[PDB]
Amino acid sequence: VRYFYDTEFIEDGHTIELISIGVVAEDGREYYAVSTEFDPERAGSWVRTHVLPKLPPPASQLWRSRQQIRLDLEEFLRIDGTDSIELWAWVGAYDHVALCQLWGPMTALPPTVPRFTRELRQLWEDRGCPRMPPRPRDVHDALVDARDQLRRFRLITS
Amino acid sequence: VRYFYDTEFIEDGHTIELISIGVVAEDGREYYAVSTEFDPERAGSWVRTHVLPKLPPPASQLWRSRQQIRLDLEEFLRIDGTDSIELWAWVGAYDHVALCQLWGPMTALPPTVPRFTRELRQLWEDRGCPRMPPRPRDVHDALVDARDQLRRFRLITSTD
Ligand SMILES: Nc1ncnc2c1ncn2[C@@H]1O[C@H](COP(=O)(O)O)[C@@H](O)[C@H]1O
Ligand SMILES: Nc1ncnc2c1ncn2[C@@H]1O[C@H](COP(=O)(O)O)[C@@H](O)[C@H]1O
Ligand SMILES: Nc1ncnc2c1ncn2[C@@H]1O[C@H](COP(=O)(O)O)[C@@H](O)[C@H]1O
Ligand SMILES: [Mg+2]
Ligand SMILES: [Mg+2]
Ligand SMILES: [Mg+2]
Ligand SMILES: [Mg+2]
């Protein structure tokens, strides 16, 4: 049913070039990958500072082509499976576009992937902004961030 | 406080090329603009059939440059006024990026404009999936669509 995701990327007002994506399922399963296809030379100061140094070493099998990440997510999200799929992120408009663009134009998204991502900050506000734990030390690592979103959701819906 | 918006665009898996944007305020004010900068020749069949035919005539003042649209939104949203801005759309990921891209990168969004758009489809489910009126005939006209979102918002929230 529910997946919580977050991405890092280099975005210049025109494209969103995926660096990494973390996805964590309410059931416990976790997926993380880093694209071998973004150009680190195109990163701005902020991304160079906060994002790139947290990436796995270059030898890690966590580094994957975009075709591999798409295929990995079709499996991970169980797109062919029995359960309905619900995607969640925090303040995730660009995250949703980054995800969908692994498949192409919005058209190309598998029939069972939702055409919207539920906005965890909206749920949080709707429930009176209950106290959340402080942000993890390793923010801007997309798996750490994705994990933190499931944590928040569990707390909010507790 | 609250603004309801919709956008039309040509999206290709790489970029989102803005066609038009409609914004309606809770107070009754309305804004609509069609960009002079997108290339209608890229549009696919669906956009050609459902979007382009609804655009104003060539000489309408509704046609504006992207820089003028940004300027018009800074004023329309009252970005220097004291109200906090809340933006809402229905199934609004691409709309939010299209809106925010009138300022360029994330970096450049005026600090008073929220970094997220509230998802009206998400609020609808949360409030028990109330039966809604049908969508208007003239859907795919961004101002029509924006107006209809403020309408559904008022109906969804009427006993909150
Ligand atoms: N303060 C910021 N300055 C510049 N880019 C940012 C900033 N916050 C977020 N981003 C961009 O948004 C992506 C997702 O952000 P996050 O999930 O906060 O790490 C980052 O990889 C950057 O491209
Ligand atoms: N059924 C569809 N097929 C192809 N593109 C679509 C479809 N629905 C929406 N779009 C795209 O999404 C934009 C906004 O959709 P809307 O707000 O429904 O009028 C359009 O301007 C198109 O680029
Ligand atoms: N200008 C922006 N437009 C959209 N999303 C943004 C922008 N700047 C930052 N974000 C996102 O906001 C997330 C953090 O939200 P929050 O901690 O509630 O401020 C970041 O991880 C980014 O992914
Ligand atoms: Mg994030
Ligand atoms: Mg590839
Ligand atoms: Mg992150
Ligand atoms: Mg729309």
Curated annotation (Swiss-Prot), chain A:
SUPFAM superfamilies: Ribonuclease H-like. GO terms for molecular function: 3'-5' exonuclease activity; magnesium ion binding; nucleic acid binding; RNA exonuclease activity. Mg(2+) binds at residue 6. Pfam families: Rv2179c-like. It comes from the Bacteria. The keyword Hydrolase applies. NCBIfam families: RNase_AS. Homodimer. This is 3'-5' exoribonuclease MT2234.1.
Swiss-Prot record, chain B:
Signal peptide: none annotated. Mg(2+) binds at residue 6. Disulfide bonds: none annotated. Residues 6-9 are annotated as: RNA binding. GO terms for molecular function: 3'-5' exonuclease activity; magnesium ion binding; nucleic acid binding; RNA exonuclease activity. Exonuclease that cleaves single-stranded 3' overhangs of double-stranded RNA. This is 3'-5' exoribonuclease MT2234.1. It comes from Mycobacterium tuberculosis (strain CDC 1551 / Oshkosh).
